[PDB]
Design an enzyme around this catalytic site. Structure first.
Site, short mmCIF file in Angstrom:
data_model
loop_
_atom_site.label_atom_id
_atom_site.label_comp_id
_atom_site.label_asym_id
_atom_site.label_seq_id
_atom_site.Cartn_x
_atom_site.Cartn_y
_atom_site.Cartn_z
N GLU A 140 0.80 -1.23 0.00
CA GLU A 140 0.00 0.00 0.00
C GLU A 140 0.83 1.28 0.00
O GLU A 140 0.37 2.29 -0.53
CB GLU A 140 -0.97 -0.01 1.19
CG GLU A 140 -2.35 0.52 0.89
CD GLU A 140 -3.40 -0.04 1.83
OE1 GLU A 140 -3.56 0.52 2.94
OE2 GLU A 140 -4.05 -1.04 1.47
N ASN A 190 -7.40 -20.49 -7.73
CA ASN A 190 -8.71 -19.84 -7.74
C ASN A 190 -8.65 -18.33 -7.49
O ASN A 190 -9.40 -17.58 -8.12
CB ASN A 190 -9.67 -20.51 -6.77
CG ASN A 190 -11.04 -20.74 -7.34
OD1 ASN A 190 -11.21 -21.40 -8.38
ND2 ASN A 190 -12.06 -20.21 -6.68
N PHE A 196 -7.75 -4.56 4.10
CA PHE A 196 -7.17 -3.22 3.96
C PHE A 196 -7.41 -2.65 2.54
O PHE A 196 -7.71 -1.47 2.40
CB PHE A 196 -5.66 -3.26 4.24
CG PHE A 196 -5.23 -2.81 5.62
CD1 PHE A 196 -5.24 -3.69 6.69
CD2 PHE A 196 -4.73 -1.53 5.82
CE1 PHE A 196 -4.82 -3.27 7.96
CE2 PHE A 196 -4.32 -1.11 7.09
CZ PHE A 196 -4.37 -1.99 8.16
N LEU A 201 -7.29 6.89 7.56
CA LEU A 201 -8.27 7.95 7.36
C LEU A 201 -8.29 8.86 8.59
O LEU A 201 -8.38 8.37 9.72
CB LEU A 201 -9.67 7.36 7.08
CG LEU A 201 -10.79 8.37 6.78
CD1 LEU A 201 -11.48 8.03 5.47
CD2 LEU A 201 -11.80 8.43 7.91
N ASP A 261 -6.76 11.39 -1.02
CA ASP A 261 -7.32 10.08 -1.35
C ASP A 261 -8.62 10.22 -2.14
O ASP A 261 -9.40 11.14 -1.91
CB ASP A 261 -7.50 9.25 -0.06
CG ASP A 261 -8.42 8.04 -0.18
OD1 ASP A 261 -8.00 7.04 -0.80
OD2 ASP A 261 -9.54 8.11 0.35
N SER A 267 -12.98 -19.38 -2.78
CA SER A 267 -11.58 -19.28 -2.37
C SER A 267 -11.41 -19.37 -0.85
O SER A 267 -10.58 -20.15 -0.39
CB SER A 267 -10.93 -18.01 -2.92
OG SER A 267 -10.48 -18.21 -4.25
#
Ligand SMILES: *CC(C)C(=O)NC[C@@H](NC(=O)[C@H](Cc1nc2ccc(C(C)C)cc2s1)NC(=O)CC)C1CCCCC1
Length: 356
Positions: A17, A134, A106, A36, A26, A119
């Site tokens: 990230e 998968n 996240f 945030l 953002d 999955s």
């Protein structure tokens, strides 16, 4: 609070990230690794100040970002456990595989992760190979191909190998460019080597486009942080991979919004640290690089500044020249003498008009 399982998760999401030490915009007010702050900049700084316990003015240290990250991890863990579709999967997974699942939360939230019904089932059943296949069939594999592959590998192996091996490859590559007299940065020699390896001149526009994508602070300076974060964000682990990314960077500048961002970045990159303005000689050198084939009066502008201005160039004047260059008629007839342009551009039009 310290009794909870562990913090390889911080470096894992720093790679996937990214870590921003200043308040970033953002798609709103965000700092660190996706933290945030609110939903007014004064309220964002107020929330950040109260959380950190000092007057930050929007700038934090790595350790301060780590504290906000740990709070976000704990919040995510609580959310997963309150989710009927995620808790049975989470509880069944080992410490490493739990971190890969939190990483997915996240990136797309609990609702998005919950969508991987088939999955998650395979993951709960400890069918690692079947789940890895998968999860690769998913659209999530195309949005972030570098991140998704790293997370899939974490679920397939139950190790930190994808992140360890990327850090190893980048660290070995960094060693080729680092200054012998300073390990934390890349010196003049290293920058030259990096440019030589890319088969590009260090004063070329291609290198300047790279600097824009790396968000490099100053010309003739390149820190370990800029190199590590730039390469990871661009999805490159070698010079060849970065070389192959250059055509896409070029195409991006054909869009005016991206060109404005690149043009304005050039001022910040070109200037000397500790100076608010850009020296005339340096400004002309960068103008000939970024406004080449975009401004008809470029040479006449340069000639005017060298003979009449002979002084520094402020940020606002730099920014406004792009607007002037795109609106100005070939005969300068549409120019408003009392239309908000800086004095320097008014004087340039007066100087240029008798020369047609
Ligand atoms: C003293 C010195 C290094 C110098 O000659 N400065 C002026 C000229 N600048 C350049 O040649 C710079 C060199 C670079 N700095 C960096 C910093 C980070 C990166 C990473 C890989 C993103 C790369 C480079 S190359 N080059 C540029 O700014 C690109 C155009 C020069 C003289 C006049 C023409 C422009 C500036």
């Amino acid at each position: 609070l310290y009794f909870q399982s562990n913090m390889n998760i911080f470096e894992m999401l720093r790679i996937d990230e990214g870590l921003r030490l200043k308040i970033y915009k953002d798609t709103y007010y965000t700092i660190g690794i996706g933290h945030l702050l609110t939903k007014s900049l004064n309220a964002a700084k107020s929330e950040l100040d109260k959380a950190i316990g000092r007057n930050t003015n929007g700038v934090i240290t790595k350790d301060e970002a780590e504290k906000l990250f740990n709070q976000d991890v704990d919040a995510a863990v609580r959310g997963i456990l309150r989710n009927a579709k995620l808790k049975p999967v989470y509880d069944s997974l080992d410490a490493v595989r739990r971190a890969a699942l939190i990483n997915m939360v996240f990136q797309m939230g609990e609702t998005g992760v919950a969508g991987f019904t088939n999955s998650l089932r395979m993951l709960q059943q400890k069918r690692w190979a079947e789940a890895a296949v998968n999860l690769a069939k998913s659209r999530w594999y195309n949005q972030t191909p570098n991140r998704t592959k790293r997370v899939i590998t974490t679920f397939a192996t139950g190790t930190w190998d994808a992140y360890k091996n990327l850090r190893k490859k980048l660290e070995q590559l960094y060693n080729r460019y680092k200054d012998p007299q300073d390990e934390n940065k890349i010196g003049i020699d290293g920058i030259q080597q990096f440019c030589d390896d890319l088969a590009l001149d260090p004063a070329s526009i291609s290198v300047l486009i790279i600097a824009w994508k790396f968000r490099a602070a100053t010309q003739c300076e390149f820190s370990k942080q800029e190199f590590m974060d730039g390469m990871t964000e661009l999805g490159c682990d070698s010079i060849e991979k970065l070389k192959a990314q250059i055509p896409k960077m070029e195409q991006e500048l054909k869009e005016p919004g991206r060109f404005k961002d690149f043009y304005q970045f050039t001022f910040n990159f070109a200037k000397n640290p500790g100076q608010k303005g850009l020296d005339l000689e340096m400004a002309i050198a960068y103008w000939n690089l970024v406004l080449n084939g975009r401004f008809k009066f470029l040479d006449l502008w340069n000639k005017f500044l060298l003979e009449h201005h002979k002084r520094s160039i402020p940020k606002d004047t730099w920014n406004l020249l792009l607007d002037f260059s795109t609106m100005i008629a070939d005969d300068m007839s549409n120019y408003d003498e009392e239309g908000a342009w800086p004095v320097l551009i008014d004087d340039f039009v007066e100087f240029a008009r008798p020369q047609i």
